[PDB]
């Protein structure tokens, strides 16, 4: 379907968009006490894999799944909350602020770099077709 | 012997396309952490050789092989990510973004130059075919 | 082996080259992997040059035949 460069750069754009979405969702839920069921929000992470279609030669980036972080959930002593345990510590998400801003900046700069790569390739693509005519 | 220019410039175009593809693959995976085998993505680069069989004076260019770039793997301290080292040193690819962008630009320019060579050569072949007429 | 045989061979070679370029172009348009636009465009270029060569040879050959048939005996 897609040309190889198109597929690689578009996969890069989609992967960076997914990472930015995960960062934004984490930054929104930084102060959430409960979900829809009664469990604390867990910071999400996105794992980049190389989609090496040929044997070890090249390939874009794919995202296998969005994993839930395994870090000590923040404990805040609020015994009056219905979600407090026997000891009374309500669970707050493990979303760090600085890491998510850094992730947003890095995802934006990778997105823009891949956009520039596509823009650069495009002129050569259109100029290839003048070879025959 | 203007026909050999077709082969020379076509080989050059194919080699520059392969180089641009490899550079774009490296750039799109600068943020990757995992490969299909779990290994960290290693930045790769093509090798250019003169496409001359033994006894041939000058030919085009050919891609001998794709080799892993020689650079230290970028160590990141994240001993919370499921992928880690003994001391929590996540290994990230050694992609130098500026180098890859410059490589993409250079490949595009060389590609366009070879296209111009092919165009003017075809024009000359037609004019030669209109020798006496 | 003969002049007619050589002309038939040249026509077959030119047609085979043109058909190969066309088939590769259709394969690329199909979306099948491994076919590069560079090779398609270069092969179309070569096929066009070969067709033009055949046209010129035909033109001259016809001109020479007309010249010979114009001879007064």
């Amino acid at each position: 379907a897609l040309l190889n460069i198109f597929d690689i750069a578009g996969s890069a754009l989609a992967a960076q968009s997914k990472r930015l979405n995960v960062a934004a969702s984490n930054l929104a839920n930084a102060d959430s006490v409960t979900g829809p069921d009664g469990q604390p929000y867990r910071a999400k992470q996105v794992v980049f894999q190389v989609d090496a279609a040929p044997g070890q030669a090249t390939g874009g980036v794919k995202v296998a799944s969005v994993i839930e972080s395994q870090a000590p959930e923040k404990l805040v002593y609020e015994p009056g909350n219905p979600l407090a345990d026997a000891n009374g510590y309500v669970k707050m998400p493990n979303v760090d602020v600085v890491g998510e801003m850094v992730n947003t900046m890095s995802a934006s700069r990778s997105y823009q770099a891949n956009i520039e790569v596509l823009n650069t390739v495009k002129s050569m693509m259109l100029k290839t077709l003048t070879l025959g005519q | 012997a203007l026909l050999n220019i077709f082969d020379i410039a076509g080989s050059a175009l194919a080699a520059q396309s392969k180089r641009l593809n490899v550079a774009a693959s490296n750039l799109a995976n600068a943020d990757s952490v995992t490969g299909p085998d779990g290994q960290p993505y290693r930045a790769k680069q093509v090798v250019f050789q003169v496409d001359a069989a033994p006894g041939q004076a000058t030919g085009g260019v050919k891609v001998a092989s794709v080799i892993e770039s020689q650079a230290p793997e970028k160590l990141v301290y994240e001993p919370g990510n499921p992928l880690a080292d003994a001391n929590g040193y996540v290994k990230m690819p050694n992609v130098d973004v500026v180098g890859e962008m410059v490589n993409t630009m250079s490949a595009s320019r060389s590609y366009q130059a070879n296209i111009e060579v092919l165009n003017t050569v075809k024009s000359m072949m037609l004019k030669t075919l209109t020798l006496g007429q | 082996v003969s002049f007619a045989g050589q002309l038939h061979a040249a026509l077959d070679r030119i047609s085979d080259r043109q058909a190969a370029a066309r088939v590769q172009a259709e394969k690329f348009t199909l979306g099948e992997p491994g076919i590069a636009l560079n090779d398609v465009m270069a092969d179309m270029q070569k096929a066009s040059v070969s067709m033009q060569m055949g046209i010129q040879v035909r033109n001259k050959l016809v001109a020479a035949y007309q010249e010979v048939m114009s001879m007064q005996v």
Binding site: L2, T58 | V22 | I35
Partner: peptide, 13 residues
């Protein structure tokens, strides 16, 4: 060969 060109159709068919 091992590396497909940038202007080739997705290796993944």
């Amino acid at each position: 060969g091992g590396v497909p060109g940038a202007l080739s159709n997705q290796p993944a068919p």
